[PDB]
Amino acid sequence: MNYNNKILVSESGLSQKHLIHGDEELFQHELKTIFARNWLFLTHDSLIPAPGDYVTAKMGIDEVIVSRQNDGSIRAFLNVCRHRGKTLVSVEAGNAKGFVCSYHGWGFGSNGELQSVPFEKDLYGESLNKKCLGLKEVARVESFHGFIYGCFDQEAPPLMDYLGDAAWYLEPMFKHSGGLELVGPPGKVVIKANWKAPAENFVGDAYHVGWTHASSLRSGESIFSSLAGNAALPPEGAGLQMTSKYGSGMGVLWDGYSGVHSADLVPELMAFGGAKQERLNKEIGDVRARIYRSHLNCTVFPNNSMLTCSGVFKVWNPIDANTTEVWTYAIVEKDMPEDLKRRLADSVQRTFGPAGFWESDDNDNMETASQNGKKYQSRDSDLLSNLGFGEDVYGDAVYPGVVGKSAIGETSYRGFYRAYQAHVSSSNWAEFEHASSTWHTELTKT
């Protein structure tokens, strides 16, 4: 397939070829043009707070070691020995000054440097140039309020610029709340879906909630419960949708601070968020203080998603076109009482974890939609994302980005797939930028 010419996503992001969820050659191409090019979630400060603390993480299909340095910074390295290529670290988290390979015993520092080689003097003499044998380092590692992302491409925009207009929406919860902590360890489950299926669902799919999650809404008693079985449409002005230049987007459901949490947490949460909102009015204004305590369903392009307020934090780790390893963490506000943090973390897993009853409602949807992308008669068929097209705006006086001023629509799908297509057809960041110079105009046509 010629990725320079093939129209996988139609103009304005209105449709996508179904093959994108099933084609293995395209998956291999995404490794280069999506995963090796863009910012990918690694970890949080809260998981590696002290010097020597490390975790392992996936970046695309690659595995990296992410380590807190003595100077307080974080560096990340391929989890692959520079000698004969054995996997260096076999655990998920720990604290160490270095990593020793179990094959021939080469010792690498937390800073990636090759520090020791067994019997170096007797064997290599002075001929081994250890300075050139450090672990292969992730070029770019940056933080968004404690959330650590990595990028293999030195040419990428800074993480903040990459978040584009989405950053404005995230800041009240990520920054002005006093900060978030990520509660680990994550749940980990393999699903038979393409990574894009859950990514698109979290980025912009409010339409599915009442029907897909009818049973979870009805039996859980959460605040979004009126939606169960499409019994009731949210009122006008119930929310909005947004998207951005580099593909990140989200839905906003006004005031939904208790999120998917069952009735047992609703009063406590609605009290807590409301109280903090009252303080924030004076600091960041009424609109942004309201956004803080509003439910955001967001994907940070390409494969990191979240539900703020619900506190669900996801990584959709790609394995092949119909296989994804789902990592699920809980996010909590640092200044919440510890007992509430604990119950919130359990509730995140209860609803969206490995045995999350909400997340289970989504399985067949994402798995079959992905697997149908391999079927002969569907490969060239068009997945539709036209809901709300022709009613999006850009440059609004209050809400930035390409915005649909309605709670339910496909605005964020269009921006996600516009960026996806721009990357797949480009060889580098400069080409992506050239392909994106009229990004908002394309999205707001008609």
Binding site: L47, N95, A96, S215, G220, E221, D264, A355, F357, E359
Partner: protein, 192 residues
């Protein structure tokens, strides 16, 4: 067991062994086997309400954890060692049961098929509470759905059972440390 000598054994596991190696009552192991076989039968036929009514105590903690992989020699990193796949009280189990029975639970049509295999049953009365029965057992759980989806779960269960209403022994705690770190079963949406 001496865990200084038996280097691979956790303090918790050594504690649990001690419970059963001591007093052995064949009759208690019998009762325990009946209790678990009947529970598994109710679950297998998806009689989830009957399971709650007959097998589950009002004070239940139903917990399944997933433990992060750490170095065997790790002694400094002290952050949360595990997450809760399940950590349910009775009301939370009831929510999950209602979710299963809801006619808009689309994933339950066509009807799922469950088959459970319970083995290695051990039983011992608690030392302090002569009304608390410790039961250990292992489960293989087979779930089949939608023509060709097949998921098999494997686990050891540390239970506490106590007589409740009517003098019927009911589950007041189940603890499972799930042995696979990354699930290859689509989800863990089964009652182990």
């Amino acid at each position: 067991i001496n865990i200084q000598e038996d280097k691979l054994v956790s303090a918790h596991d050594a504690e649990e062994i001690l419970r059963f190696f001591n007093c052995h009552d064949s009759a208690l192991q019998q009762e325990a086997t009946t209790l678990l076989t009947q529970e598994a039968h109710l679950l297998d036929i998806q009689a989830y309400r009957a399971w709650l009514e007959h097998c589950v105590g009002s004070e239940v903690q139903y917990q399944v954890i997933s433990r992060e992989l750490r170095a065997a020699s790790e002694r400094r990193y002290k952050l949360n060692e595990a997450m809760n796949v399940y950590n349910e009280n009775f009301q939370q189990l009831k929510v999950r049961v209602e979710h299963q029975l809801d006619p808009q639970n689309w994933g339950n049509s066509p009807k799922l098929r469950f088959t459970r295999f319970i083995t290695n049953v051990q039983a011992a009365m608690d030392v302090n509470d002569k009304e608390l029965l410790h039961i250990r057992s292992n489960v293989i759980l087979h779930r089949a759905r939608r023509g060709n989806q097949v998921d098999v779960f494997y686990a050891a269960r540390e239970d506490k059972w106590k007589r409740g209403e009517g003098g019927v022994r009911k589950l007041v705690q189940r603890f499972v440390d799930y042995p696979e770190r990354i699930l290859q079963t689509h989800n863990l949406m089964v009652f182990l």
